[model samples]
Target: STGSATTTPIDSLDDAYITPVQIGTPAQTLNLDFDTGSSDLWVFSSETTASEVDGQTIYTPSKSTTAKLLSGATWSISYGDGSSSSGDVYTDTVSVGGLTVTGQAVESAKKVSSSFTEDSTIDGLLGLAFSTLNTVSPTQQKTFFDNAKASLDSPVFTADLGYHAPGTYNFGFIDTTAYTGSITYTAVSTKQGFWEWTSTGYAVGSGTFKSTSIDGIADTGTTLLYLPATVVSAYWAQVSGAKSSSSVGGYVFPCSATLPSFTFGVGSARIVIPGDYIDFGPISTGSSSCFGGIQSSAGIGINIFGDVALKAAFVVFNGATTPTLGFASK
Candidate 1:
């Protein structure tokens, strides 16, 4: 309901991916991930025990006496990246862009790693995404969005990397410049998380859909889009030896010399990601090839379409009015 994540450099003195956001009323800033996959505002805090939560940005309430800790609050959040953190709860006044919300509920990490602790000017994460993933708990109660909605001035919007260069990601501003056409909104499918849209499936060339292809679940937290095995095999069917492809590594092409013109579809939008992103060369089983968007993450609860697919679009999280996400072109 409020703002954008910081899109700046915050990693470390050497190299880092810092995205700053104006948090803490009168606005204190923090570097955080604008992950759409999960919806919770998390920051490392004094409550975080030294062992597990060491090294990440820990909030000093000394500077803001008004910042109140909901003493008994405890939250354990598990990220799709396989990383997890537990934190106590606190209430702080946070600002994003020009919008300010007082007593905004936040989760303070109790345990973290040095990598997360040493983050430069970036202190915590402001998850303003659509999913209702984080909450106030030992018993799990309210979420930030559940609290901040009625206080917003405009619909929440997010911008692309402005050409995909690394910088801080911001929240709060509805970048009209990013709006080239009427903002298209996909109806909300009921839930406490993920703005699930009704997706038809992906396409091969201009307008082809493999009848057996998969419909995707667009999530910003996930790093990549997960396609169904049927869709993956069908996509690679055009390749020379893609038949014996292994899922161990995401998806691959065998040779970078060749490429495919693939596009992901979501209603009236089409996101064309470069083949390199599709390459799952990230996994231990390396190859010049990329992983298919659809893979076998079966028990992971639900399938997700990661931020990679979101790079091309300006997404809006409208908790104020229909509590739905509207996709606009940048």
Candidate 2:
């Protein structure tokens, strides 16, 4: 069986994508961030500290007759940006779109960081990365995708993120009409529990493509595209007043600057990110300076092809015994 769900951006900046999911016997619906970079289906719930709760919808396990505590199972996870959450686990019926999984592991948050608490846009996060990355101690649980893959028409999923608009997440089958060109397939290295692959260089604007291997992961959870310092510098240099500022924490430039498009190769396939996409948004409310969508990956260790890059193309996460990634322009 296959299913499809619509994913909407939380804000105008496309900071994150949220998808509605149902959990429990009565189907309590909650909007969750479908994150491909991490492996832990966690949620803000009745167990969370009241003070930490904002406007997010909470999951009440007691309301679900099928919910059962997974005794002794606990989980804790922190993100690169330092936000974290921890809690006990429960097995419940979970549904996304029309696909349903019985006895799915659902982590109920008892504690959450300020960043997560303040973000009212998402009720929780649903991880789609490798099951090996799950943080449930003593008993690592499989992700929703991992648990449902065997029953699917095809062991695959696709992400079609849109810039400043709603997109889609399709499971079990690829929608041929969703993309415009033939997909280019590449080997995926799950050694680090990520959909990591090597990109075949990049070019600034209409410049020539550089032939070099740049290792990175396609993380739908992340907001921006992070590349090697050299590549980021090359792209920003083409913009008239762009500068890497310590105060702003990334490359910023005048909002009116003429930004150039960026193109990256994938086994002879070139996906072009429009100039407007590179201009992330204003640095501050009504400010003339804007933050760049492309940033240096020096401190990150591994480059990240985040939503900024993923939105430029249709991506497939093939979950075969030997995983692979497929990219196509839309």
Candidate 3:
């Protein structure tokens, strides 16, 4: 899902187009793109007089008469996806799983695009990933969690969502009851965010990284993983049974035997990946089975363990702590 490979901040990256995350209900829902790029939650309202809606139905909370708007508060969110939204800041009762948090700050857009109506399956994206990507302006900079964390009864708040189907995503306080693991953090100088990561080790297919001594970096915001140059080469060398098929602009291995599982060590936490993601997502040229998880870049700048890895486990990013991130079983 991540085509933008540049590690450094690119102003043009903001113009990369927009993916709307709609909001509202499951059956009678509104469409809008959920953005971790900003912490405020919002949806396209029936009141959207802007050109983007293309005349689709807007989810009017007033119809429910249960929604609440924050007094004197307004929000504007800017995303790397190249689209921006400004709306009246409001509050509402949002419940995910067994955890219920009220007075949640959300946005109700007054304008939108027609493309949003074209794709109907994706109701919206619930960006409960990281804090650094929050688009909350300095005036309303406090994160949704920064204000609500203290009130939550759970030890940690996490979302276990899978996008493979229409209704598989689940958001709320994680059942840490199943998580018996601990967190290993990486200390950085950033004021408050997770745009950077450092990796220690990785493996392609079933084979390990050529150099076993490795470190890793994780970004839930990133949709894919980027291994080191040598690691990519090593992985491709081991793609023994993979036959390349071009699908999703990448390699799609034949539906043969089970795929090899790749693993990575992030300090104390270990991240594992399903083999199909590599072959299915890799691009083919001529004959060789290129590495899917590891992209072919000029060189290895940083190891990005994106959403692919986050899907398999529960991760926590607490910047208030020195190291910042923690991992455990979902």
Candidate 4:
């Protein structure tokens, strides 16, 4: 009953970690982004415009004898970064690590926005969000995780996300040695189909920690950390020569600037992101200006604890009866 699957990052940009997954009878492999922010397992496929597919690996349903088209079914998704994908549906075998789910809904993209088509690394998205968030029309489809949960011993998964480093995403088991100190658990609200929890407040660098209640979602699909506009402004004010770069779409500062760590309140747990974690990376071509990973949740209307913040800690996504999230320093 303790079936488990541990995955490793296929490439850099720990922002969007990908792992090899099998999606057919004879095991056609594809790199999928394991996302907890949305629910829909989709892939670029033969249905995609041949010219628009670009360098991405495509899943050919015709090649798999186990594949069956879900008559008249379709799926469409739009991301926060203006990325979108649309396609038809098929039921096939999908496996990650060693766990396999047969007859899983595999959305095959017929149309994709430039944002997704241009990215050659990500072949598809394996959503971990609750099944209710699935966008499949006519009837909602269960995610890979959801379809395999009954076979899991604890119905839990741990996101050991990293930054430019390889990390493991464990299913149905928590590796005790992954982090140091005790893990703090916080109740999660899944009403919005996201792992939403309240943060007691945050501080700029080592500034006094405020008790302001902030609502944020733990998103593995996003690259940067987004907070309230005021909180983002406060943090940037402490950095010298940091300003919003309209061209870059975020705040940028001198690469040599000494930035402070940000501390977020998770119940009684104080998750501190090192100053280096906020340093997203260079925004220009070999310029001294770099982008800050922490930005304002302006258009989204909700804070997102993206890769920048998640990489600094080991996180547990518990879905047994009561949904909960556990955080600890790694």
User: Which one wins by lDDT: 1 or 4?
Assistant: 4
Clashes of 2: 0
Model 3 C-alpha lDDT per residue in residues 98-200, reported as the tens digit of each score: 3345555556666443444443332333444355554444445344454455655432344232323111222224444634566555443333343345555
Residue pairs in clash, model 2: none
Best by TM-score: 2
Ranking by lDDT: 2, 4, 1, 3
On TM-score, who's better, 2 or 4? 2
Could you arrange the candidates by TM-score from highest to lowest? Answer: 2, 4, 1, 3
For model 4, how does the per-residue alpha-carbon lDDT over 156-266 read when each residue is reduced to its tens digit?
Answer: 888887666777777787889999998899989999999988888888887999999989888888888999889999999999999988888889999889989999988
Q: In candidate 2, what are the lDDT values of residues 1-330, reduced to their tens digit?
A: 888999999998899999999999899999999998999999999999999999999999999999999999999999988899999999999999899999999999999999999999999999999999999998999999999999999999999999889999999999999999799999999999999999998999999999899999999999999999999999999999999999999999998899999998898899999998887788888999999999999998999999999999999999999999999999
Candidate 3, residue 248: Cα displacement in angstroms equals 7.8
Instruction: Tell me how far the alpha carbon of residue 217 in candidate 1 is from the true structure, in angstroms, after superposition.
Output: 3.6
Q: Which ten residues in a row have the lowest lDDT in candidate 1?
A: 8-17
Estimate every model's Cα lDDT from 0 to 1.
0.56, 0.95, 0.46, 0.86
In terms of lDDT, the poorest run of 10 residues in model 4 is 1-10
TM-score of each: 0.77, 0.99, 0.63, 0.95
Candidate 1 residue runs with Cα over 4 Å from true position: 1-18, 23-28, 51-55, 113-123, 129-132, 138-147, 159-163, 166-173, 205-207, 210-216, 239-249, 280-297
